[PDB]
């Protein structure tokens with residue numbers, strides 16, 4: 001049967017083509033994950049249909065209800081057969097779905113509006129004039145929450161009680177906040193998005209310091225899925241033959257606007 | 259039963275303590291992987307015994323005999339229950355044993371003796387005065403062999419026919435060759451070892467350019483192993499709680515001699 005792929009609109013992984021209203025099926029989308037999905041299906045011998053996750057979320061479990069939302073939820077409840085998106089491999093998600101080995105490596109980073117007097121997380125922790133936060137859901141927020149690490153602890157304690165909220169709903173919101181806060185807001189996000197945005201007009205943002213940790217994005221399938229093993233080998237095969245780095249340069253730097 | 263862990267002597271992952279002749283059991287060893295093994299066993303609730311792989315190899319399959327050697331072979335033939343070492347996650351190995359998600363991220367890098375007029379793989383490819391090669395077995399050699407990539411292809415073609423051989427048997431051999439060749443030999447090795455050696459006396463080596471690819475080291479277990487699932491979750495748990503980065507700084511930079 002045709003494999004149902006769930007994904008999410010996040011640049012430059014999956015984006016609607018400018019003329020999407022005139023197209024149908026998979027041709028309506030473009031991006032790193034759209035190309036990766038084609039390669040995975042090709043190497044695994046299956047036909048597929050790209051779909052955008054119904055609730056527009058990545059995947060977290062609600063306290064109290066214990067229900068999984070986002071792409072993870074669609075896999076958990078059988079609404080989709082595979083998730084191909086910038087879904088960070090985490091302990092809680094690994095417990096309910098299967099992840100392929102990383103197709104992309106990344107780490108938590110700091111985004112500032114050019115000119116902001118901040119060079120590291122250390123600088124952020126030892127001050128409050130410049131507010132800073134993470135996405136309101138996701139692996140970055142969890143990193144600070146579970147962090148023994150010192151400077152990261154002063155940061156989580158600060159972010160948790162900061163008013164107004166320093167957390168943003170999406171990457172677009174965090175970037176807009178950095179750009180419109182005249183240097184008074186720094187956004188903690190994954191290096192992949194940071195590096196991408198740095199090469200997009202208005203070219204007014206910058207990634208500072210080194211990554212705070214090392215993690216990866218993985219292709220997800222429901223536990224005990226037949227396609228799981230084949231997809232994992234496909235990711236390794238594509239990475240070893242340079243397809244993945246070629247794909248990143250295509251969507252990150254070949255398209256640089258700065 | 260006590261879990262048999264197979265590992266390999268590779269600095270600073272596993273090293274014999276200076277006074278090892280006076281110790282017994284696991285206390286004879288020290289290093290990043292020795293500490294990681296303790297953490298994995300603790301989080302997985304098992305007793306273990308560290309052993310050094312009999313043939314002193316990582317794991318490759320012989321053509322003609324089709325027999326697996328090294329740590330991979332010990333897992334494949336049931337001589338060990340788990341491998342905890344800087345074993346690169348690769349397609350061919352993933353097909354015969356199970357790998358946990360990466361406990362360390364790395365990429366192929368270039369090591370030169372300080373002063374060598376080389377800054378990138380591109381520089382290496384467009385010349386021959388300065389010889390360069392990889393370890394005679396392993397994932398780095400395979401990267402160049404399977405590389406479509408252009409400059410990397412000119413490099414593999416050159417390395418394959420270069421005389422005398424530009425390939426080295428071990429990290430120690432590659433480093434000794436770089437140090438004793440008066441700038442006429444550059445070694446292609448994993449960034450982890452490169453970064454480590456750069457901070458070790460004589461402090462005469464340097465890592466140049468950016469990594470050529472992105473890969474990781476994983477903990478290995480025989481296929482269908484009971485411990486596999488638990489070990490994978492332990493790696494993710496330890497990484498999220500900062501144990502892994504803390505462990506890398508302990509063995510890489512806290513001990514810097516330069």
Ligand SMILES: C=C(C)[C@H]1CN[C@H](C(=O)O)[C@H]1CC(=O)O
Pocket residue numbers: 010058086087088135137138139140141170171188189190
């Ligand atoms: C864009 C979002 C909400 C994602 C993408 N990867 C992370 C995840 O899969 O949780 C989230 C980012 C972050 O947490 O910084």
Ligand SMILES: C=C(C)[C@H]1CN[C@H](C(=O)O)[C@H]1CC(=O)O
Pocket residue numbers: 268316344345346393395396397398399428429446447448
């Ligand atoms: C040190 C050795 C021989 C190893 C360690 N990781 C790689 C592996 O697991 O193949 C090899 C290095 C390399 O290929 O550059």
